[PDB]
Amino acid sequence: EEVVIPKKKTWDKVAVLQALASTVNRDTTAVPYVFQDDPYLMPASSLESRSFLLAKKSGENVAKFIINSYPKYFQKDIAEPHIPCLMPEYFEPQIKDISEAALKERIELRKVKASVDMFDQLLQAGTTVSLETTNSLLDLLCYYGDQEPSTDYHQFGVTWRAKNNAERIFSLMPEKNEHSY
Amino acid sequence: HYVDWRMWRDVKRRKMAYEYADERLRINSLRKNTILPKILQDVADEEIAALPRDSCPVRIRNRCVMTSRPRGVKRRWRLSRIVFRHLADHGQLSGIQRATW
Amino acid sequence: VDVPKDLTKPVVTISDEPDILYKRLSVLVKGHDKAVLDSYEYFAVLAAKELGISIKVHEPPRKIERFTLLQSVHIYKKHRVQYEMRTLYRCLELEHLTGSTADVYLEYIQRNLPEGVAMEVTKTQLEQLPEHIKEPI
Amino acid sequence: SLSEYAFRMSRLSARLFGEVTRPTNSKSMKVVKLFSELPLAKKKETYDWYPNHHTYAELMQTLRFLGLYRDEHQDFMDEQKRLKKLRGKEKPKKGE
Amino acid sequence: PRRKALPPRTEKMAVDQDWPSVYPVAAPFKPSAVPLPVRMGYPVKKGVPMAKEGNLELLKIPNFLHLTPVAIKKHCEALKDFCTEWPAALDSDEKCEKHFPIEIDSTDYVSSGPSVRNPRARVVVLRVKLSSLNLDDHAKKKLIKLVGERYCKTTDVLTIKTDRCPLRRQNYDYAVYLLTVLYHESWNTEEWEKSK
Amino acid sequence: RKNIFTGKRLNIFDMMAVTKEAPETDTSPSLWDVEFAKQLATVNEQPLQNGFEELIQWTKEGKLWEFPINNEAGFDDDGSEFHEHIFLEKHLESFPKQGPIRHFMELVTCGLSKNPYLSVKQKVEHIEWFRNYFNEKKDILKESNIQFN
Amino acid sequence: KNRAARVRVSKGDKPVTYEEAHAPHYIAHRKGWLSLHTGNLDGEDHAAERTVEDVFLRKFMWGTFPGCLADQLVLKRRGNQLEICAVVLRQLSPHKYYFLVGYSETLLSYFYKCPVRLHLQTVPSKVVYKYL
C-alpha cells in the first residue's frame, strides 16, 4: 500500500475574495457602492453624485489634516499585525546640520525651498555631496518647477519660469551625467 | 487629564513600576533563594531598598478607569460597579444581561 | 444584457511541496445567541457539504458565568443586582480534509463569521515519522 | 530516600525536558518560577490599565476647537462660567 | 424646497432577481434594500411589531442575508477550484494510523478586536502510539518510565505538549526534537539502569 | 479593405523585441519613475463597485486581516529558533562550572527557557546583567570564599 | 423603587423609542445588546479595551452628529473590522452627512488602527414605540 499525497495549492491572500466576487454582479437597482445605500443619501442627479463624492473626499482630507497636524494623538499602536498605512505621516525634515543627511531628507520629503537653501549652505561650506544627490535635487526641482508641494494646509501658457534655482544649480553642478540631462 | 489626582498618582506608579520591573525582578531573584551567600543577599536587600518607593508593584491600585473608584472594580472590565451597572443596564456591553434562575 | 463578456479567474498555483493532511478540525464557535449559532451551523454545514467535506455537528454544554454587584450607591448591602454572561457552544467536527481544502473552508467560514461569535479551531495534523527516529543515532 | 535507579531515571527525564537537574528547595525554585513568568508590572493589564486619558481629552478638545465635535458638557460649563463672570464671581489672580 | 427622500429601491426590485448581487458581503440590515416586509419588536397591547423602517432591533441582528443558500452554493462552486482531493487510500482511521503515526494538534483562535495576537495559539500537542514506533521491551519500558504521566497506559499513546517557545513553529520543532531525543535515549543504555 | 498592420513602415528601428530590461535596481529610487507609477495607478484607479472589492483593497493595504486567521501572523520573535530559546547554557561561559553561582545561574537559565514571553534577546540581556552584577560583586564573593573572577 | 435605565410614565405624552421603553431586565428578552463583540465571551480577553473603545465611539459619534442621531448606535466587531450603524434624522443636508461620514471613518480608523465603517439609516423623525 502506497498513499498518494496530493500537491499543495498556493494562492495570494486575496484569491478567495476575488473568487467570491467573481460570482456577484452589479446591482442594477442600486447606486454605486461608494454612496450610502439610503433613500435620503442616495444621489439623485449626476451633480448630486459628484457633490456627494467631493464632500466625502473633503471629509477624508480634513480628517487626514487633523491626523498629520496632531500626530501625537495617533501614535498609540494597538493593531496586531502592525498597519503602516494607519500611522501618522511626516513631511517636515528633522536633521539640522549642514550635511548630506539633511539635504537628502529634504529631497526625499520634496521640501524644495529648504532643500535649495540647505544645498546653497552646503556649497558655501564646501562639504561633501554625492553626484547622485545633486542629480536627485535637479530631478525634484525640474519636475516641480520650484513649486512647493501642496499639503493639506499650512493651465494655458508655459508653467516654467525663466529664472529658477534648477538652472542655477545645473550651471553650478560639478559633474554632469546622462541621467541629469 | 485623568479623572483625579489619585488616578494620576496611580498612572505614575504604574509607569515607574514598569520602568523598574526588570531591575526589581533580578534583585529580588537574587534575594529569594537559599543558594547564594548571605552577604550577597544582604547587599541585594539594601539595593532593592535603595530603589524608589513608587516602583514597588504592591503600591499599584486597580482603580476604575472611568471614575477612579478604588474599590468595587471588576478586573475583567476595569470598571466600578456603578459605571458597569450603568453600561450593562443601557445594554452597551455585549453579552452581559440580568441574571434570573 | 450588461453581463460581463468574460470573467477573470483568480490565480491558483500548484506547489510541488506535498499538501498538509488534516485528520480532524474541531471548529468550536462560542456565542451569546443560540439562533445566531444555529444559523452559522447551517451555513457551515451547507458550505462543507457543497465542498464535499465530511462534517459532524454537536453542541457542548453551555456555560453561564454569574456575578453580583451592590444595587445602590452608598449603603444597601442587603440589595444586589445579579448579572450573567451566557457562552453557548457549537462544535463542528470536520474529518479527512486536505490542507488547501482546510485553508479555503476556514477562510470562507471565518470571513462570514457573525459579530459576537468567537471561533476556536483545532487542527489535528497527520505527520510521518521523522528521519532521525527510524533508527538510533 | 529513593531507589538510585529511579532517582537517576528521573534526573535523566528532567535533563531531557529541561527541568532543574539538581536538588533544590522551594525557596530557590522561587527563582525559576520568577523567571518563567512575566513580572506583574510588565503585564499588559498592569502597565496599560488605564486608557490614555491625556490622548482622549486632548483629541476631543482639539476637535471641539476645530468645530468638528460639539462637546455639550463643555458648552454647558462655558455657559455657566460666562454667567458667573457676569454675576461678578471670578478667579483671583495667582500669587497676588 | 426641502429635500425629498426617494422611494426605497425595493420597489424597483424584481421577484426573480439575483439576490446575492444585492448583498455580496456581510452588511447591516437595510430597509431600503430588503424587500421582505419583516417586522421585529415586542408588540404593544392591541398592536403589531414595529416595521422595518427605523427598526433598531433588526439593525442589531447579525443577519445572514448575504449568505442565502443560493449564494452559498454559488460561493462553494467558485471555491471548489481551491480545494484538493483527500487521498482515497486511507479512507479509514486505521490506515491513517498505519501510515501517519504522529498527530499534531494546534489551536487557532479568532476573536474581535484590532489585535490578532493570542498566546493560547502557541501550544502544540504531539500524539503518537508507541506501538507504531520501532521499540523493543527494554526501550519501550525505559521510554514509558522517562515520559511518566505524558503516556497513558490505557490508550498506549504518548502525548507531549510543548508551549515553552513563543511561536507555533518553534513549539512544533521542540516537540519533534523532544520525541527524537526521547526515542534515542530510550534505545540508549546506561550504567544506573542495571540496579533495578 | 485590407489589413493595415502590414506594409511599409518607418523602417528606422530594427526588430528589437527586447526593451530596456537590464537590471538597474542598485540605483537610488528616481523621483520621476515613482511619480510615473502614480500616473499608471491613476489609469487603473476606479472607485469601489461592491463590498468584495472594498475587502480586497483593504487586504492589499494591510488594513484587513488575512484569513484564515494566524494568531502569530506578522510576528517572528526576531527570527529565533527553539534551540536558542531553550538551550541557554551556551551563554553561561564566564560563570564558573560549579559552585553556588553556577547553580543559581542554572536555575535562572531554566526559568528563562520556561518563559514563552521574553525574546531571546531579553534572556541574553538578563544573563549579561547577572554576569555584570557578579563581576562587580567579585570582592564580596571572594570574601565569602566562592570561586569567581 | 428601581430607577436604573427606566422611563417613568407621567402624562402619557413623552415619546420613547423601543430601546428606552424597555427596562434592563428585558435585555436578554426583548432588546438585544447595542454592541456585539467577543470580548465578553468565555475564555476571551480584552473585554475592558473593547468596553472603553465602545464608550469613546458612542461619545464621539454623539458629538460629531449633534442632534442627528435618532437612536443609540449599534457597534459590531468582525475580526478587526468595526461597523457603526446609526439611525439618523433627515434634518441635515446630505453633503454634511457625507463629509461627516468620511471624516469620522478616517479619524476612527487612524485612531483605533482598524478599518472603521459607518452605515447611516435615515428616518424622517425619531420612531415612537409608545408614549409615557
Side-chain angles (χ1 to χ4, degrees), chain C residues 129 133, chain E residues 101-102 128-135 143 179 183:
Chain C
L129 293 164
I133 209 173
Chain E
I102 293 169
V128 59
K129 275 184 175 180
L130 294 175
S131 47
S132 303
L133 296 185
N134 199 28
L135 293 171
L143 172 61
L179 180 64
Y183 182 85

Side-chain angles (χ1 to χ4, degrees), chain A residues 106-112 140 144 149, chain F residues 31 34-35 38:
Chain A
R106 276 149 192 74
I107 290 303
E108 78 203 347
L109 296 186
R110 311 195 172 189
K111 294 278 282 176
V112 293
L140 163 66
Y144 273 65
Chain F
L31 174 138
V34 168
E35 211 66 22
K38 301 183 180 173

Side-chain angles (χ1 to χ4, degrees), chain A residues 14-79:
Chain A
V14 306
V16 165
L17 286 168
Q18 286 182 306
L20 297 165
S22 77
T23 69
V24 301
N25 305 318
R26 202 183 64 259
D27 196 350
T28 51
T29 81
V31 295
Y33 173 78
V34 286
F35 302 109
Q36 295 286 337
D37 185 18
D38 179 286
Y40 185 66
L41 299 169
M42 264 158 60
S45 74
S46 175
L47 181 65
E48 295 218 328
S49 175
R50 200 179 76 139
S51 60
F52 292 177
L53 284 189
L54 285 174
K56 206 185 187 185
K57 296 301 177 188
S58 170
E60 293 161 14
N61 289 21
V62 168
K64 274 186 168 292
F65 167 74
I66 285 165
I67 288 150
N68 306 338
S69 304
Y70 306 90
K72 72 195 192 100
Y73 303 147
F74 304 89
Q75 282 159 354
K76 186 58 167 279
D77 198 2
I78 49 170

Side-chain angles (χ1 to χ4, degrees), chain A residues 6-10 16 26, chain C residues 2 13 15 17 19 100 107:
Chain A
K7 253 61 177 180
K8 184 185 286 179
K9 284 180 183 170
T10 52
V16 165
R26 202 183 64 259
Chain C
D2 206 36
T13 68
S15 172
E17 188 170 283
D19 194 0
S100 309
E107 168 155 16

Side-chain angles (χ1 to χ4, degrees), chain E residues 2-3 5 26 28-29 31 41-44 50 52-54 56-57 59-62 111-114 120, chain G residues 18-19 30-32 34 36-38 44 50 71-72 74 76-77 79-80 85 87 90-91 94 119 121 127 129:
Chain E
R2 205 158 195 184
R3 178 171 180 79
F29 164 83
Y42 197 93
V44 300
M50 315 179 73
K52 65 187 147 182
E53 301 91 317
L56 204 58
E57 302 303 312
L59 207 76
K60 289 165 166 187
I61 284 173
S111 301
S112 57
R120 309 157 185 79
Chain G
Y18 195 87
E19 309 298 337
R30 296 182 197 203
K31 44 175 265 186
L34 293 154
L36 296 168
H37 59 82
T38 77
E44 306 290 289
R50 299 300 93 73
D71 205 338
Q72 202 52 251
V74 179
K76 305 164 167 280
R77 285 188 176 74
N80 71 332
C85 311
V87 187
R90 294 175 179 164
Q91 282 273 69
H119 311 104
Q121 183 187 148
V127 179
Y129 177 54

Side-chain angles (χ1 to χ4, degrees), chain E:
Chain E
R2 205 158 195 184
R3 178 171 180 79
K4 163 65 175 182
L6 309 170
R9 57 204 185 87
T10 49
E11 313 185 349
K12 323 191 93 161
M13 284 186 179
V15 289
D16 54 358
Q17 82 186 353
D18 177 84
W19 175 253
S21 304
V22 176
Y23 281 179
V25 308
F29 164 83
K30 284 174 283 181
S32 57
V34 168
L36 320 177
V38 67
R39 305 173 160 274
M40 194 178 179
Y42 197 93
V44 300
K45 308 177 186 83
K46 319 176 195 181
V48 288
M50 315 179 73
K52 65 187 147 182
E53 301 91 317
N55 198 306
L56 204 58
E57 302 303 312
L58 289 172
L59 207 76
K60 289 165 166 187
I61 284 173
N63 76 85
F64 281 68
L65 295 174
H66 67 300
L67 304 174
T68 68
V70 170
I72 294 156
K73 282 159 162 53
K74 276 212 285 175
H75 293 181
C76 293
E77 185 69 25
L79 291 182
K80 257 189 293 187
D81 189 14
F82 300 167
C83 303
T84 44
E85 170 61 32
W86 183 258
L90 61 83
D91 194 51
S92 55
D93 294 334
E94 50 194 2
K95 310 161 184 180
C96 296
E97 288 190 349
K98 196 167 68 179
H99 304 86
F100 294 87
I102 293 169
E103 303 183 350
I104 297 291
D105 295 11
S106 54
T107 315
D108 293 331
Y109 301 75
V110 185
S111 301
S112 57
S115 167
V116 76
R117 302 276 165 266
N118 197 325
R120 309 157 185 79
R122 81 193 201 276
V123 187
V124 178
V125 181
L126 183 143
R127 274 197 311 285
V128 59
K129 275 184 175 180
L130 294 175
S131 47
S132 303
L133 296 185
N134 199 28
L135 293 171
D136 67 9
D137 192 42
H138 166 231
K140 186 181 185 183
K141 285 164 171 165
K142 174 167 178 184
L143 172 61
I144 288 162
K145 291 211 165 292
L146 283 189
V147 297
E149 68 280 2
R150 293 164 188 75
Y151 166 76
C152 181
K153 201 85 165 289
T154 318
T155 67
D156 196 58
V157 176
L158 171 58
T159 300
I160 301 158
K161 189 207 305 297
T162 47
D163 54 358
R164 295 177 66 89
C165 303
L167 299 184
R168 171 77 57 70
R169 66 178 185 73
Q170 295 166 338
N171 284 322
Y172 177 92
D173 291 346
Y174 183 32
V176 178
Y177 158 91
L178 268 175
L179 180 64
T180 306
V181 300
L182 275 163
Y183 182 85
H184 289 160
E185 282 268 25
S186 174
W187 271 109
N188 180 25
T189 309
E190 293 152 67
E191 297 302 324
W192 55 266
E193 290 175 41
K194 263 66 75 173
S195 61
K196 282 173 67 177

